[PDB]
Amino acid sequence: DRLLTTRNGHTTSTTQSSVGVTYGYSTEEDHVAGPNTSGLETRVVQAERFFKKFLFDWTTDKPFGYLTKLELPTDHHGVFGHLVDSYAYMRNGWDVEVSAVGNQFNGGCLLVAMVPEWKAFDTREKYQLTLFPHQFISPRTNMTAHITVPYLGVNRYDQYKKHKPWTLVVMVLSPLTVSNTAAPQIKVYANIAPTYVHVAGELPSKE
Amino acid sequence: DRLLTTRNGHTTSTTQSSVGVTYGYSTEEDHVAGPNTSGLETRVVQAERFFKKFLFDWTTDKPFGYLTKLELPTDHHGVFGHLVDSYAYMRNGWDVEVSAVGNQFNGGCLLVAMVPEWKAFDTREKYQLTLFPHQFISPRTNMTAHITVPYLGVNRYDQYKKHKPWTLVVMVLSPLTVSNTAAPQIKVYANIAPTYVHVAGELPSKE
Amino acid sequence: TGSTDSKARYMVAYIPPGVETPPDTPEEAAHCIHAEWDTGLNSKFTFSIPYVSAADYAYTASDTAETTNVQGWVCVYQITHGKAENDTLLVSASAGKDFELRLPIDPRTQ
Amino acid sequence: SGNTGSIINNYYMQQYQNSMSTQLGTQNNDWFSKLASSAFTGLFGALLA
Amino acid sequence: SGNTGSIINNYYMQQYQNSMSTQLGTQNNDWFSKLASSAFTGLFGALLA
Amino acid sequence: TTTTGESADPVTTTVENYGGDTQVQRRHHTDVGFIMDRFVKINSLSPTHVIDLMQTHKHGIVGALLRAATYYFSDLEIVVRHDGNLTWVPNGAPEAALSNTSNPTAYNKAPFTRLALPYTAPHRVLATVYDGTNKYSTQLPASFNYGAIQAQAIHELLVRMKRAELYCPRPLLAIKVTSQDRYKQKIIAPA
Amino acid sequence: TTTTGESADPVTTTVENYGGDTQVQRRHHTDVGFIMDRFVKINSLSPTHVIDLMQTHKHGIVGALLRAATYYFSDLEIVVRHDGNLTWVPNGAPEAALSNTSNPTAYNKAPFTRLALPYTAPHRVLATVYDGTNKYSTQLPASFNYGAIQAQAIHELLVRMKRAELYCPRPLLAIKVTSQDRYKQKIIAPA
C-alpha cells in the first residue's frame, strides 16, 4: 500500500499506486517579498486548488520519443485565470499529478517531467530528459506520477501572458504493449494545482 | 481642520471637511464563522477597496423628499463582482463615503443614510428617515458624509443575486440654494468599499 | 465492484446552488469542492457532502414551486478507466457526525 | 424521559404509574451507540496538505 | 420578563414552555441604549450665569 | 447647546440649561418585551391558516410596533376558537401533514384553545420587510412563518409574542392631521 | 478515506478531510424514547377491541417508526371516546371477563377517557414481526397484545407508547419517487 492522498484547498486526490512525490530543484520557495513589488503583493489562497487537463492517448503506435507538452500556466477558467486578467504580475509554483490508467497487463513506460524554459528538443536530447525533475509511469508498477516544483525565473514575479516558466512534458520511453487482457489504450490526464499564488499590480476594469 | 483620511486596501480617500464617521447599529461584525458554512468560508481581502458610483445632480428644482437610492451590492466590475459570480454565498459590510461638492456660498441640506431591507417610503415616512444610520451634508459646513455599517440579515451569509440587505439613500431635506457666487448645481458621488468580505461555496466554471 | 484487472479513477463534486445546471464535465466541476480517487486495494471511498446554505437549517421536503434544487447537486464523474467496461460502482449514504434533524412531523397520507 | 416535562413530582406512586422493570444479573447496552462511535474517522494512507 | 406576573414557579419545564436559545461565542448588546446614553448633555461654549 | 448638526451625533439638552430640575422617569410601559406581550387579533382566517405575524393589523398597537422594526424574534402563544379538533404543524411542514393526528392536535374543548408555541423558523431571526430581488428558485419569504393550523372551521385567532426582541427601528406614524392645529377626538369622561 | 468496504466496518468521514469544521449537533428530536412518546390513532374499532400496536397505521410517524424495529417494549396510555362504561382487561384474559365491573372499569365522563396502562404480556419483549413456522397448537402470536377494552360503543382510540425501547432496526421507507429528480409537494407558506 503506497497510498497517498494530496490536498490543495478544498480539493483532494488519492492514489493507491503512488511511487512518492518528486520535488524539483528545491524543497521550499524563494522569498516572495522582494524589492520589485514594493510592499504591494498579496497571496490568493482561493487559487490554490486542482484543475484538470487532458494530455493525450497513449496508444501502441506512438514510439519512443513521442512527446506531449503543456506549458504552464495554461488556459484557466477559475479564480486562477481571473487573477491573470486582474493583476499585472504573479508568481506561484506547481503541484502536478499525472494518470495513465490502463491495467497491470499492459506494458510500456512514460516519462513525466517538469521543464523550466521550454525549447523543442532534438531527438538525441530526449535521452537526457531525466536531468529535469521527473518520474515514470509503468503499468506493472504505478498509475500515477506526482511532481512538485517551485516558482523560478530571471524575474521574481512574472507576466504569464508573455512568458511561461514551467512546462509539463510526458514522453513515451517504451511503447505501450497490449494483450488480450490489457487495456487497448491509455488516456493520459493531468491534475494540477498552483501553489503559493501571489499577485501584484491591480489592473483597471475593462468595464 | 476636520481632516480625515480613510484607507481600504491600496486605496485612500481624504477630506478636509469631515464631520466624523457614523457607525450604524454596531461597531463590530457578528461572527463570520457560523454553522451554516461548515468550515468552508474564506476571507478575500483583495475585494476590500473603494469603487465609485455616481448618484445624481443636486439641482435647485428638486424639492424636499427628492430621493435617490443605490441598493448594495451594485454592479461591480472588479474582484468583488467576480466573487459574486464565483461563490454561492457571501457576506460583507460597507464603508460608505458620499460627496456633494459645490461651495460655501451654496445652501440646502442633504440627508444620507444607509437603510436595511429597503421599501419605497411613503412621503410622511420621510420625516423619520433619521432612525436609520445617517449623516448630513450642508455646504456651509461639509462636503462629505461617511457611514460605516456591518453585515446583517436573517441569514448569516447571503446570495446577493437574490437579496440586497443594505441600500444607500440620499435625500433632499432642504433644497439647494444658489447665488451669483455659489456653484450652479452639485453632482453627488459615492465612494464605497466592502468590508470583511467572506465567500463560501465555490461554484463551477462556465467554461 | 470491478475485477482485479479493471481499473478506474473517479471524481465526486458538490455543486452548490447558484448555477443554472450542473456541469457535465470534470473540468468545469473541478472548480468546486471535489475529490478524486482511484481503484486499488481498498474498494470503498467515502466523501462528505458539506452543509453550506444561507439559513442555519433546511427543509427536508421540497416545495412544488422549487425549480432548481435549493441545496445544489452532487455529480459523480469517471475521469478514465482501463478495461473497466460494464463494471460497477455501488454508492450508499449515511449521516455524518454533525447531521441533525429537528421538528417532528407526521406527513404521510393515512 | 422523553416527551414529559412536568416540574412537579408525580401524585401517584411509581409502582402504579408504571410497570416495575426487574433484572436478573438501564445500562450502556446501546449496541448502536457503541457501533456508531466506533466508526473510522481518520484517513487511510499518507497525507500531503 | 415583560407582562408576566406569576409569583409561583412554572409547572412545565423550561425546555417545553419556551424554545431554548443557543449561542456561538442576553448581553448588553443594546445599541440604542448605548446610543442614547452617549448623547451630549452639556453646553458647548462659555457660560455666564 | 449648539452643536455640529451634520455629524448626526445625539444631543439631549435638559431644562437645567435655563434653571430647571430634570425629574425621575419610569419607562416600564415602553419596554419592548413588555409592550409586545399582549394578544392581538388576526383578521383574515380560513379552515387552514398559516401563522404569519404580518397578517396583524398595521395600526394596531402590536402590528404598528412590530412594523417599526426591521428584524424580530419571539416565541408565541395562540388562542383559537374552532370547530372540531385543532392541529398545528411547525414551520417547514408539507400542508398535507395538517390532516394527521400525531402532529400536535388539541381536541375541542369549549370555549377556545390557548397554546404555547416555539419559534420554529430556520433563520436566526425574521424580518418585517425583505428586499429580495427575487428570493425564489411586498412578498416575504415563505419561510417567514410560525407554522400552520387547521380545524373544521376557525372562527377566531389571537396571537401573542413571547420573549420579543426587536432590531433596527423604522418609521412609526401617527394619524395624519388635517385640522389646523391638533387632532381632536372624544376622550372618555363621566356622564 | 479509502477502506475495505467488504468488512462492513463503519466509516464516518468529516468535512475536515478537505478543510472544513464539523459542527455541533443536537439530536433530541431523534431520541427513540421521546419520538415514540405521542398519541397515535387506531383506525379499526369495535365495541370489543384488543389493543395491538400493530393496528397502528404503517406510514404514521409512530407506526412507521415502530415497524422499523424488530423488538420493542413499553408501557401505554390510552384515550377512548366511548358510550357507556369502559372496561379494560389485561393480556391473557378470557374475552368473557370484559363484562365484569370489578375489572378496571371507568365510568363514563365526558368527553373521553384517558388511562395509564402497564405492559402486561408474558414475554420479556414483543415483536413487530415473528417468523413462526406455526406458533400454534403475517399472523403474530395472540399473546402479543396490551389487553382489551369494551364499552357499549367505541368511537375513538388513541394510543401512546410510554418508556419505549426499540431493538434490531429494520427498513424504514420514504414515499417512492416517480418524478425525475425530487418528490415535490406544497409546503406551508403565508398567503
Burial C25-63 (b: 16+ CB within 10 A, else e): ebbbbbbbbbbbbbbbebbbbbbbbbbbbbbbbebebbb
Compute the nearest-CA separation of A3 from chain D (Å).
5
Q: Which residues pair with B144 in a beta bridge?
A: B99
Task: Report d(CA G176, CA G167) in Å as an integer.
Answer: 26
Structural domain count of chain D: 1
Task: Report d(CA F40, CA D18) in Å as an integer.
Answer: 43
Q: Give helix then strand counts, H and E, for chain E.
A: 2, 0
Q: Which of F112, F65, F121 is nearest to F90 (CA)?
A: F121
Do the bridges between strand A134-137 and strand A166-177 make them parallel or antiparallel, or are there none, so unpaired?
unpaired
Cell digits for F179?
Answer: 385640522
Alpha-carbon separation of residue A14 from B204, G1, G13 (angstroms) = 21, 9, 15
Beta carbons of G188 and C66 less than 8 angstroms apart = no
Do the bridges between strand C44-45 and strand B87-100 make them parallel or antiparallel, or are there none, so unpaired?
unpaired
Task: Report d(CA C15, CA B80) in Å as an integer.
Answer: 21
Going by C-beta distance under 8 Å and a sequence separation of 6 or more, which residues neighbour residue G179? none
The alpha carbon of residue F167 and the mean position of all alpha carbons in its chain are separated, in whole angstroms, by 13
CB-count burial class (<10 Å; 0-12, 13-18, 19+) for F177:
exposed
Going by C-beta distance under 8 Å and a sequence separation of 6 or more, which residues neighbour residue C82? A101, A102, A103, A106, A183, A186, C6, C7, C8
Q: Tell me the three state secondary structure of residue G116.
A: strand
Contact C106 F100 (CB under 8 A): yes
Do the bridges between strand F69-83 and strand F113-117 make them parallel or antiparallel, or are there none, so unpaired?
antiparallel
Cell digits for G26?
Answer: 443536537
Beta carbons of A60 and A180 less than 8 angstroms apart = no
Contact C56/G at CB under 8 A? no
What number of CA atoms fall less than 13 Å from residue C62's CA on the CB side? 16
> Can the peptide bond before residue F111 be classed as cis, meaning omega within 30 degrees of 0?
yes
Q: Please, which residues 1-49 of chain D have a Cβ atom closer than 8 Å to chain G?
A: 1-4, 17-19, 32, 35-36, 38-45
Taking each helix axis from N to C end, the angle separating B79-86 and A79-86, rounded to the nearest 10 degrees, works out to 170
Contact C101/F at CB under 8 A? no
Burial B129-144 (b: 16+ CB within 10 A, else e): bebbbbbbbbbebbbb
Cβ count within 10 A of residue G135:
12
* DSSP code, position A157: S
Alpha-carbon separation of residue G160 from A76, C1, C51 (angstroms) = 62, 46, 35
Beta carbons of F157 and F80 less than 8 angstroms apart = yes
CB-count burial class (<10 Å; 0-12, 13-18, 19+) for G41:
buried
> Can the peptide bond before residue G111 be classed as cis, meaning omega within 30 degrees of 0?
yes
* DSSP code, position C108: S
End-to-end CA distance of chain G: 48
Residue located via cell numbers 466496518: G9
Do the bridges between strand A42-43 and strand F153-169 make them parallel or antiparallel, or are there none, so unpaired?
unpaired
Residue located via cell numbers 444561507: C54
Helices (H), chain D: 14-17, 31-37
Beta carbons of A11 and A50 less than 8 angstroms apart = yes
Cβ count within 10 A of residue B160:
21
A131-135 long-range contacts (CB < 8 A, ≥24 apart) are A132/A24, A133/A22, A133/A23, A133/A24, A133/A25, A134/A22, A135/A19, A135/A20, A135/A22
Site from A74, A86, A202, A207 to mutate, B interface, most B CB atoms within 10 angstroms: A202
Residue B130: phi and psi, rounded to 5, are: -80, -5
Q: Tell me the three state secondary structure of residue B67.
A: strand
Quote the Cα angle for B157-B152-B155, to 5°: 35
Q: Which residue of D has its CA nearest to E14?
A: D5
H-helix or E-strand spanning residue G158: strand G153-169
CATH number, residue D42: 4.10.90.10
Q: Which of G129, G164, G125 is nearest to G40 (CA)?
A: G164
Cell digits for A182?
Answer: 490489457
Q: Give helix then strand counts, H and E, for chain G.
A: 2, 10
Q: Which of F51, F122, F111 is nearest to F82 (CA)?
A: F111
* DSSP code, position F36: T
Beta carbons of F128 and F70 less than 8 angstroms apart = yes
Cβ count within 10 A of residue G186:
12
Q: Which residue of A has its CA nearest to G20?
A: A10
Task: Report d(CA B196, CA B33) in Å as an integer.
Answer: 12
Strand blocks (E) in A117-203: 134-137, 144-149, 166-177, 186-202
Quote the Cα angle for C64-C67-C69, to 5°: 100
Cell digits for G2?
Answer: 479509502
> Can the peptide bond before residue A73 be classed as cis, meaning omega within 30 degrees of 0?
yes
Residue type at C105 in one-letter notation: I
Task: Report d(CA C22, CA G181) in Å as an integer.
Answer: 13
Residue A44: phi and psi, rounded to 5, are: -115, 90
Compute the nearest-CA separation of D23 from chain E (Å).
31
Residue located via cell numbers 395472540: G142
Q: Which of A167, A158, A169, A155 is nearest to A197 (CA)?
A: A158
Task: Report d(CA B73, CA A42) in Å as an integer.
Answer: 24
Cell digits for G158?
Answer: 388513541
Cell digits for B77?
Answer: 466590475
Task: Report d(CA F15, CA B22) in Å as an integer.
Answer: 28
Contact B35 G20 (CB under 8 A): no
Ramachandran class of F31: left when φ > 0, alpha when ψ lies in -120 to 50, beta otherwise: beta
Task: Report d(CA A29, CA A40) in Å as an integer.
Answer: 19
Compute the nearest-CA separation of G61 from chain C (Å).
5
Going by beta carbons, is chain D in contact with chain F, meaning 3 or more pairs sit under 8 Å apart?
no
Contact G13 C46 (CB under 8 A): yes
Going by C-beta distance under 8 Å and a sequence separation of 6 or more, which residues neighbour residue A152? A25, A30, A116, A165
Quote the Cα angle for E23-F119-F92, to 5°: 110
Do the bridges between strand A22-23 and strand A144-149 make them parallel or antiparallel, or are there none, so unpaired?
parallel
Cβ count within 10 A of residue C99:
14
End-to-end CA distance of chain E: 46
Residue F64: phi and psi, rounded to 5, are: -60, -50
Task: Report d(CA B27, CA B19) in Å as an integer.
Answer: 18
The residue ranges of every structural domain in chain B are: 1-207
State which fold the F1-191 domain adopts.
Jelly Rolls (2.60.120)
The CATH label, of 3.90.420.10, 2.60.120.20, 3.40.50.970, 3.30.830.10, for the domain at B1-207 is: 2.60.120.20
Task: Report d(CA A207, CA F160) in Å as an integer.
Answer: 53
Task: Report d(CA B200, CA B41) in Å as an integer.
Answer: 4
Q: Which of G150, G145, G147, G159 is nearest to G90 (CA)?
A: G147
Residue E34: phi and psi, rounded to 5, are: -55, -50
Beta carbons of B108 and B59 less than 8 angstroms apart = no
Q: Tell me the three state secondary structure of residue F149.
A: strand
Q: Which of B110, B150, B144 is nearest to B130 (CA)?
A: B110
Beta carbons of G183 and G123 less than 8 angstroms apart = no
Residue B83: phi and psi, rounded to 5, are: -55, -50
Task: Report d(CA B167, CA F130) in Å as an integer.
Answer: 12
> Can the peptide bond before residue A175 be classed as cis, meaning omega within 30 degrees of 0?
no
The alpha carbon of residue F184 and the mean position of all alpha carbons in its chain are separated, in whole angstroms, by 28
Q: Which residues pair with A119 in a beta bridge?
A: none
Q: Which residues pair with E12 in a beta bridge?
A: D6
After which residue numbers is chain G interrupted with C–N beyond 2.5 angstroms?
137
* DSSP code, position B9: T
Structural domain containing residue D36: 1-49
Contact A10/G at CB under 8 A? yes
What is the 3-class SS of C61-89, one letter each residue?
CECCCCCCCCCCEEEEEEEEEECCCCCCC
Ramachandran class of B79: left when φ > 0, alpha when ψ lies in -120 to 50, beta otherwise: alpha
Cβ count within 10 A of residue F80:
22
Task: Report d(CA A139, CA A103) in Å as an integer.
Answer: 6
Contact G189 F142 (CB under 8 A): yes
Task: Report d(CA G9, CA B157) in Å as an integer.
Answer: 37
What number of CA atoms fall less than 13 Å from residue B106's CA on the CB side? 25
Ramachandran class of B132: left when φ > 0, alpha when ψ lies in -120 to 50, beta otherwise: beta
Burial B76-88 (b: 16+ CB within 10 A, else e): bebbbbbbbebbb
Torsion angle (degrees, nearest 10) of CA C30, G24, G30, C62: -40
Task: Report d(CA B132, CA B147) in Å as an integer.
Answer: 11
Q: Which of B87, B104, B190 is nearest to B142 (CA)?
A: B104
Task: Report d(CA B37, CA G21) in Å as an integer.
Answer: 9
Residues in chain D: 49
Task: Report d(CA C104, CA B115) in Å as an integer.
Answer: 38
Task: Report d(CA F107, CA F60) in Å as an integer.
Answer: 31
Beta carbons of G85 and G107 less than 8 angstroms apart = yes
The residue ranges of every structural domain in chain F are: 1-191
Compute the nearest-CA separation of G68 from chain F (Å).
18
Torsion angle (degrees, nearest 10) of CA F106, F112, F116, F122: 70
Site from G4, G11, G13 to mutate, C interface, most C CB atoms within 10 angstroms: G13
Q: Which of A50, A29, A28 is nearest to A96 (CA)?
A: A50
Site from B36, B40, B202 to mutate, G interface, most G CB atoms within 10 angstroms: B40
Cell digits for B196?
Answer: 470583511
Rg value, chain E, Cα:
21
Alpha-carbon separation of residue C33 from B200, F157, G20 (angstroms) = 10, 48, 11
Task: Report d(CA B109, CA F8) in Å as an integer.
Answer: 13
